[PDB]
C-alpha cells in the first residue's frame, strides 16, 4: 500500500498531472485500502454483501472531502501564524506571505472554498 501512495503523488512532477486528478485518485487508494483493510480483520463484514462494501468506499470518500473543506481556513491561519513574524523577519515575510497565499489560493480555487488573503497581514 505504501507503493500506491507514492505512485499517485509522483505523477505531479512526471506527467504534469492536474492537482485535481492526484487528490481524487489518492482518496480511492485509502477508501480502496480501508475497504481492503477491513475484509482482512472482521469476518461479519466480509460476508455483509457486495452492495455493502462499495458503499463504504463512497461514504469514506465523501467525508474525506467534507473534512478537508471544513479544515482549509483553520489551516491557513495555522500556516500563517507558524510563519508570520515575529516567527520570521518582517523584511523576509515580504517575500513569504504572497507566495504561500498564492498556493493557498490555488487550493481555495480547486476545492472552491475561497479564503480571503487577509489572514496574511503585515
Amino acid at each position: 500500500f505504501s507503493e500506491r501512495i507514492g505512485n499517485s503523488l509522483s505523477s505531479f512532477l512526471s506527467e504534469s498531472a492536474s492537482l485535481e486528478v492526484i487528490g481524487n485518485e489518492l482518496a480511492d487508494n485509502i477508501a480502496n485500502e480501508i475497504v481492503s483493510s477491513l475484509q482482512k480483520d472482521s469476518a461479519s463484514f466480509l460476508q455483509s454483501g457486495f452492495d455493502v462494501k462499495t458503499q463504504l468506499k463512497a461514504t469514506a470518500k465523501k467525508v474525506l472531502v467534507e473534512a478537508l473543506k471544513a479544515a482549509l481556513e483553520p489551516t491557513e491561519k495555522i500556516v500563517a501564524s507558524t510563519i508570520k513574524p515575529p516567527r520570521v523577519s518582517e523584511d523576509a515575510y515580504f517575500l513569504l506571505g504572497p507566495v504561500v497565499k498564492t498556493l493557498f489560493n490555488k487550493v481555495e480555487d480547486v476545492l472552491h472554498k475561497p479564503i480571503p488573503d487577509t489572514i496574511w497581514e503585515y
Epitope: 485535481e20 486528478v21 481524487n24 472531502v65 473543506k69 481556513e73 472552491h112 472554498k113 475561497p114 479564503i115
Partner: antibody, heavy 121, light 107 residues
Framework: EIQLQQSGPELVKPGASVKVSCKAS????????MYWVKQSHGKSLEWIGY????????RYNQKFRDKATLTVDKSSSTAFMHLNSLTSEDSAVYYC??????????????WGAGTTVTVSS | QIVLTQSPAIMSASPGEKVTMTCSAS?????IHWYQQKSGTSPKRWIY???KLASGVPARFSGSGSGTSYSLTISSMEAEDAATYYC?????????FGAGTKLELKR
C-alpha cells in the same frame, strides 16, 4: 422542494448600481455554494463569480472583478449580487445557482428563475 | 480562457433520428456537464459528470467525449428533446461555455 427564488426585473438608470437577491429553501442554505451567471442575447453564458456562505469568501471572474460585489444573509437564507457602473453591455438576464464540490469539476444542479435587468435612461 | 466552440450552431432533427452535437475545445478536459434550456426558461442540469444523467432525464441521452472533442448524442429524437444545449467546463478558471447548439424538430 428545493427551489431558488430571485428578485424581479429591474429598470435601472445608466450609471447606477443594483442589489439583486436569491433566496433558498427546502435544503440547508449554508451547506451549498452560490454562483452567479449572466446571459446576454439569450445566447451567450458567462460566469461572474461565487461565494461561500459559511466563510463568506468570494471568487470572481476577472471580467467582473470590480463590476460585481456579492453578499449574503443567512437570516433570510439569501444571497445577493451587487453591481456598479451599469452600461448597455450590462443589461441581460442574471441567474443564481447551487453547488457543492465533490472532487470532480463543479457543475450546477439548481437554477433560479432568472432576473432580467434593464439599463436605460 | 478556454474557448468552447459548439457546432452546428443550429440543428434540425426528425423524430427518431440520431442527433449529435459537438463542443470543440482549445484544451483538454476530464469531466464536462451538459445543460438544456428551452425558450423563456432557466437552464436545467442535464448531464453531470460527463455521462451521468440527472434526476428526470430519459435514457435516449448518452453524452460522451474525450479530451478536446466532447459531444452529446440522442438515439431517437422526440418532441420534448427540442431545446438549446450548452457545454460547460471547470477544469481551469475561468469557467466557460460553448456558443450553443439549438435543436429544432422536423415537421
Amino acid at each position: 422542494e428545493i427551489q431558488l427564488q430571485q428578485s424581479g426585473p429591474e429598470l435601472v438608470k445608466p450609471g447606477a448600481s443594483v442589489k439583486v437577491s436569491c433566496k433558498a429553501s427546502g435544503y440547508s442554505f449554508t451547506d451549498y455554494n452560490m454562483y452567479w451567471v449572466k446571459q446576454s442575447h439569450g445566447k451567450s453564458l458567462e460566469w461572474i463569480g461565487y461565494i461561500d456562505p459559511y466563510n463568506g469568501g468570494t471568487r470572481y471572474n476577472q471580467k467582473f472583478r470590480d463590476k460585481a460585489t456579492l453578499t449574503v444573509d443567512k437570516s433570510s437564507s439569501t444571497a445577493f449580487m451587487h453591481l456598479n457602473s451599469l452600461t448597455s453591455e450590462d443589461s441581460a438576464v442574471y441567474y443564481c445557482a447551487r453547488g457543492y464540490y465533490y472532487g470532480n469539476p463543479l457543475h450546477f444542479d439548481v437554477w433560479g428563475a432568472g432576473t432580467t435587468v434593464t439599463v436605460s435612461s | 480562457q478556454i474557448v468552447l466552440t459548439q457546432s452546428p450552431a443550429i440543428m434540425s432533427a426528425s423524430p427518431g433520428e440520431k442527433v449529435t452535437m459537438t463542443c470543440s475545445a482549445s484544451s483538454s478536459v476530464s469531466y464536462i456537464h451538459w445543460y438544456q434550456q428551452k425558450s423563456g426558461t432557466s437552464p436545467k442540469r442535464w448531464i453531470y459528470d460527463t455521462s451521468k444523467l440527472a434526476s428526470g432525464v430519459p435514457a435516449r441521452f448518452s453524452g460522451s467525449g474525450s479530451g478536446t472533442s466532447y459531444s452529446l448524442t440522442i438515439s431517437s429524437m422526440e418532441a420534448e428533446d427540442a431545446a438549446t444545449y450548452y457545454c460547460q467546463q471547470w477544469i481551469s478558471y475561468p469557467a466557460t461555455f460553448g456558443a450553443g447548439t439549438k435543436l429544432e424538430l422536423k415537421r
